[model samples]
Each structure stands twice: as C-alpha cells, then as structure tokens.
Target: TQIIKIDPLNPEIDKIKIAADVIRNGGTVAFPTETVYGLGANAFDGNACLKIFQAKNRPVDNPLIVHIADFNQLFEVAKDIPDKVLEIAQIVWPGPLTFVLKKTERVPKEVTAGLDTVAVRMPAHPIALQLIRESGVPIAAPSANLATRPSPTKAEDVIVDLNGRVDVIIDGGHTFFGVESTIINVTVEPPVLLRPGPFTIEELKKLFGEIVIPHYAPNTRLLLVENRNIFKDVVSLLSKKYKVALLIPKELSKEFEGLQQIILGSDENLYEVARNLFDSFRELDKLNVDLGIMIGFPERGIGFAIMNRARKASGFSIIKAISDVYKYV
Candidate 1:
C-alpha cells in the first residue's frame, strides 16, 4: 500500500514527475479524468494492470480502457483502425468518447481480457493529459472507485475510496462530466455502440451512418413485469425464462419467491434513480436473487442516464434479452 496527496489544481511539476516516474517504471497511480477519477498504470505492463484490478476488486472480465495523450499514440496502443476512427478521432479525440479498436501487437493481452479489441481514450482534463504526456506511455485505467459503486467526482472521494490500494492520488478538483466515457466498439465492419455517454447517437451517425445499438443475450432469466411491453418479441422470449416480478406502486421491492423487483422510482424522479442504481445493484447483488428486476425507464432526458447504467449492468439487454456479458464467449 502506497499513498501520496498533492493538489493538482496548482500542480507541482516535481510531484507530477514523481508520479509519472512511477508509471513510467510500471507502477500504478490514480488520476482524475474530466469524467471521473481513474486508477491507471502503464498499459503494456501486466503486473501494473493487475494492480488496478486488485485495488478496485474489479472483475477481470470488465476490461479497462487505455488512456493516451494523442491520436499518434492511439495507433501504438491499438490497431485495426477503420477509416471512420480517424474521422471520429479528428472530431472527438480530446473529449469523452472511447473508441473500441482492435489491440495492436504491442498491447498486453491481459489488458484486453485476451480479446482482440481494446478500449482507448484521450481525456480532455489537463491533469489527465499532463499525466499521460509525463508518463510517456499509454495508461490503462478505469473509474477510480469500488466496482459497482458511485464514481468519484472530487479528489477526496478518490482518497476515501482508493487510499491504501494505489500509489498516488491526483487532486485536480471536481470533474465536469461526472460519469464514465461513452464507449464505441469497432470490432465489426459497421461499428457498434457498447455504451452511451455525452455523445448522442445522432452525433455518431455523422461519422458512421446508422450505427447499431447492441442487444442483450437470448434465453437469459431476468425479472420484469407482465405488462409494459416495450420490445414485444424480446419480452415474449424473456418472459419464459425470467419470472415477471411486478413492480407496483409503493411496493417496488416487495419480496417474492424469486428475484426482487426494483422499479426506477415510485415518487422519486430520474436523478433519484440515477443515484440509486448502484446502491440498488449493491443490495441486489447481496440478495439471493437470480436477477433484480427494475421498472423500465423512459427513453429521453434523464432517462438517458438511467438506461446507460441499466444497459451496462444488464449487458445491454434492451428490455428482456441478455448477451455478450464480455466481448467474447
């Protein structure tokens, strides 16, 4: 366990050098991105990568994203660059969108979970860019918080969550974007969107026309209500395997013989549910339920955040189906 606390707002170049030196030497360090605090290490080092998982207790299955300083370094860390990637990179590289390109020969296999694809990003935050440039290497990173917990916005939250588990904590003030980056998977010819963030789907169409939204796997048992049929075909198929745990008004969490149901909100609003999903998942994960059913959310406005989280947790299962828990089988 190692720890160093410094103000990144008024960054001492020497302190940045020390932390960057540690990363250059293959040691793990925690830094802030515009979106959330990220625990990072040299992307090419397996031991350093493993330290992140060990620190956050993150499942090896949910692969980490490699943060690079610029597009030039992007090709070094990942390959199979489609022409469209360059187009998008030219437009959105310094922002929050994370492109999932195939890994180049140089990237460590453990970083991609033995899959050919890798997640890469160029953060907009000055401190993140400074760390990447200072380290002189791409850093594999994930949100700096406990797995399935609220992402940290302030540096103190990073200290509170990852004190003994990391090498250094960068105190670069609060983030503007307080959620994870949008992730786009380019493994296929027509790129697929694995996750959504600030970048809207329409904005994506300008680069890659008609990008497909991913779907959940088939024949998976998940809980839901009998009515409120969104995707008719998907719901019909899922209903057979998953028990419909009706989430009625004032009784969202009523006990059932099977999985527990969690409606998005009873009296609370969208922000209420957005803030509650991780907490619900935390509790639900502990309960003896195969799947914790949720009340389906709306399709616009605050619902966007609600669905983004649900999609990730449910593995992008639109309404009923669940698939591709990981990139590969």
Candidate 2:
C-alpha cells in the first residue's frame, strides 16, 4: 500500500519501474490514466488480473480493459481488428478512447471476463504510458474504485477506496479527463458505444460514420432534478422526508447555502463539470445523506458524457421539470 508521487508530464522512470515491477510480478498497482486512475496488473496473468476484480469488488461479468503503450502491444492483446478501426486507432490511440476487438490468446480469460473480445486502450498520460512500457506486459485495468463507487480522478481518491488493498498507488496528480475512457465495441456491425467519457460521440461519428450508444442500467438511488425552475421546491420537499445533499454547480452554491452541497464545477465549463462529476458523487455518499439532488446540464460536447454519468448515478430517476408537477423519466 505504498503511495508514490510521480510527475505527470515528465514521469521519473525509476519510480515508474518500481510500480512496473509490481505489475510484472503479479501485484496490483493503482496508477493514473488520462481519464481516471486504473488498478493495473499484468494482462496475461489471470491470478494477477483477478486481484483487480477482488480489490475493486468488480463484477466478474464486467471485463477489464488492457492498457498498452504502443501499437505493437495492441496486436499482442487483440486479433482480427477491423482495418477501419486500425486507421482510427492510429489517429486516436495515446488518447482517452478504448476499442473492443477480438481478443488474442495472449489476453487471459480473466481479463476478458471469459469473453472473446478484449477492451484495449493506449493512454496518453506519460506515467501510464511509461508504466506500461516499463512493465513489458499489457496492463489489465479498470477504474480504481470499489464496485459502483465513483471512479478515481486523483491519487487521493484511489487511496480512499483502495489504499491498503493494492500493492502500489501512483499519484500522478489529477487526471485530465476525470472520467473513464470512451469505449466502443469495434467487433459489432456499427460500433456500439459501451461508455462515453472525454471522447465526444460527435468526434467518433466523424470517423466511424454510424456508432450506436447503448442504454444500460447503473445502480444508484440519488435523485436528479433536471429543471431549474423547480429545483428549490424539489430540494425543500425532499429535505422534509430525507436528509438531502445538493450536487450543484459552484455558481449556485451560495444560493443553496444552508444545505449540504458538493460543487460539481461551474455550468459554463462542462469539461470541468465532467471532471468533478464522480468526485462530487463520492462526496455526496460521504455526507451520508438520505438523498442527493443534482441539476442537469445541456447534453452537448462533454456534457453528453456528464449527463450519461448523471443518468446512471441517479438510476434514471430524473425529474424532467416540465410544468410544476413532478415528472420522472
């Protein structure tokens, strides 16, 4: 459970090598990616990879993404990758995007959740890339947090959720994206977006032509108040029955002064909001509130990614705010 601080821009190779050795020797290391902190292990080692699932309490059915340093490592982990996907990868890899392709025999079944496809990404962060390169093995990793908890955006966040559980925690400062990678399953006819993060779907559309964003369930009981007009009213009402926590924008924080609130960044910058989204959720949980109320953002640019997480965190229990009546969507 050692915490090592590394320079995000120019990572110290010696410190990275220490964590790399942990990965090579079948130990789990929580390290930062461009998007979020990933709990990593040798991708080919089933026992090592299993430590990730155990530490995070991640469901077995949910597969882990293999982080690679270079294009050569991509070939080592996946096979039969679509030519078009390869072209896109050349342009997009070393960024916050993941491609799910047919798995090579080198990828352990534990990493793929016994599926034939493997999710792979080449992170843009210097520490993540150098760590993978130094390890000499594709690193299998997922968001370094307990199952259903918010993903770690800072090394401190990783320490909160996985401090003593993992072998090493690489503190590379705050992640740029503050969300998980955009995952697209390339094996499908039209690439299906498994998750949307920093990579906007609009950008992916330019490359893939037609990509489908699938709807899925996430487990949470927080309430999302999407209508500004009725926000105060909803908060007042919910507070009567349940101890309420507001996951509000910083600009509006003063307005909700007395209430327990977590700032979700400013409304003007959706990227900041997206980056602060999960950490705010984790803070709401820490408040031990009976209910958490959050306002909605415009679904454009990275807002789409923010709302995607908001929708899941609220368990689709959204208050549309049409008229004065309560409208659940």
Candidate 3:
C-alpha cells in the first residue's frame, strides 16, 4: 500500500485526487477523520464494502458507518429520513456524530450487516470531507484498525495495523478527537445512545429532553482501577498470577516496572485519556495479556464514555481501587 503525507489543515489536491480515484475503482483507502482514521470503500458497492471487512477482519454482524460529505448523501443511502434526524444533523453534522436510520437499496447489505438500518456521519475534518467530496460517492468506512483492536488516531497507528492490508494510506496527521464518533438511533422516540464519544450524553440529553445510556455487556473480566495511590493493592488483589495489561493513568506510569503498561494519560484532562483508551486495548492485545486493568474515572463528561469503552473492552469485569483497598463493584 502507498502512504502519502498530506497537510491536515490544507491537503494537496493531487493526493486527495489519488484517494478519490482508488475509491472509485473499488480500492480501500485509509484516511483520517476528526474522530479517528477510517478504512474507506465506496458505500454503494457491495464488493468494495466487503473488502473493508476482510482488511480489518471485522465481524460481519458489527456493521459499518457510511461517511458522506453532504446532507443529500443521506438520502442516497437511507430512506424515510425523519425530522429528528435532520435536527441532530444540523447541530452536529460536518462533525463527529453518526445517526442510524433505515437503510435504502443504494447502501449495500454488506455495509449494514443485512440489517434494515445504516449508520452515517459527516466528518468534521477537512481532509475527510475533501476525500468524500472528490470521490463523488458516499464511503463506508469503519475504524482503520483491525477487528477488536483499538481505533487509530494517527497515521502511524494505521500503518502498524493496516499498511500492508489496505490499498492506500493517507496521513493527514493526528485526529482532532481521539475516539470514535457518537452513534445514536434517531428512528425511535426520545432517541437512544448506541455508543458514547466526544459529543457526550449530557449535551444530547439537553437537546432531546431524554436519552437512554444503556448498560453494556462485556465478555471478559475488566479490572477498573480508580485511585493511583492504590494501584498496587488492586494489582495484588486481582491480577497476582495472571499476565496483566495495565491501562494506568499517565500519572502512575512510573509505578509499573517490567510489566505490560499502556499510559492512558492524565485524569486531570480525560480528553487525552479518552483518545488513548482504545489504542491501549490494541497494544495490550498484541502483548497477549490475560486480564486488562484500567484506571477508573468519575462518570462525568468524557469519563463516562471512557468507562463505556472500558466496560465493553474488558467484558464487564471491573474492579475499583480506593484508599489502599480493592473491591469489585
């Protein structure tokens, strides 16, 4: 695969042209978005969409998000678009918000996992918009990383996981947001939060008057460490014999020696922590650790989203550390 460096602020037209050409010809291109880098294919082509699944080894049941450059593109992929969908789009489109609506025949079943619904978002990044705009088609792009791996925020991370597997890699620099877009279903009354991200639950609650933050079911044991001061206590109590992969706050990075650790950044600024959380998961998986331990945070702002990811990533097993004692809650 060919990787080209482009300016995130002002991308070269020729580089954008090359990527657009690839998508037109059913080739997969990994490009940057404000949320994270995405592996893009022509949304209307079932074969092209299937290539995305093959490249990432993503489960066919998981579905993919279609990236578009304009509002009219929604009509191209989805049908019976509701007023609520338009309302949310006006507020968050050209940004990191995805709406799941009923699908149209124009969108391949491969993109929707044979479901009646499709996920679509208008990215906030200039480069992403340009690529879709120039491509002259809606793009079905999931996160560029492999299946069950952490999403990539930088082009280098994409290279690590997808360089050989993809057709083209566009390096538009690090993404503005370090996480995936907020996904919601506007087809229902009061709407439902399918996934949490930078858009936040609090903001959406105020806009729609009501929103549901459903509990996520995990398939593995997730150890949630809350206090930096009590990490050792949590480690000894929960992961004494297991090969542990620590998703510790950056403040506590020095505490772990000769152990697998992914520093998820300062609790003081959880935005950074949110950005690094998934990549931490990817690195931990590479290490083949037995159990995942993440430093917990107050469920305020992005912390709620991070915990959501942690809860799902660790399969619902979370342990908390506080005042030198560890307990599962």
- How well does candidate 3 score on lDDT at residue 98? 88
User: Model 1 scores what on Cα lDDT?
Assistant: 0.68
Off by over 4 Å in 3: 215-222, 226-232, 236-245, 253-261, 285-292, 321-329
Q: After the best TM-score superposition of candidate 3, give how far the Cα of residue 198 lies from its true spot, in angstroms.
A: 1.2
Q: Cα RMSD (Å) between model 1 and the true structure?
A: 7.9
Q: What is the C-alpha lDDT profile of model 1 across 212-247, one tens digit per residue?
A: 877211123333322244433433344466544333
Ranking by lDDT: 2, 3, 1
Residue 316 in model 2: shift from native, Å? Answer: 1.8
RMSD of each: 7.9, 2.5, 3.5
lDDT of 2 by residue, 1-329 (tens): 99999999999999999999999999999999889899999999999999999998877878899999999989998999878889989999899999999999988889998899999999999999999999999999988988867888998889988999999999999999887899898899888999887898889899888899871222334777777788888877777777778888898988888888888889899989988888888777667667788888887878888888888878778886644335441
lDDT of each: 0.68, 0.86, 0.82
**Clash pairs (backbone) in predicted model 1:** 216-322, 216-323, 217-322, 217-323
Off by over 4 Å in 1: 1-12, 215-303, 310-329
Worst 10 residues of 3 by lDDT: 320-329
Query: Comparing 1 and 3 by lDDT, which wins?
Result: 3
TM for every model, in the order presented, reads: 0.69, 0.93, 0.88
- Tens digit of lDDT per residue, candidate 3, span 142-258? 889877567888998899989899999999888977888888887777789998888888888877777777712222345766554566777766566777777787777777777
Q: After superposition, how far is residue 112 of candidate 2 from its true place, in Å?
A: 0.7
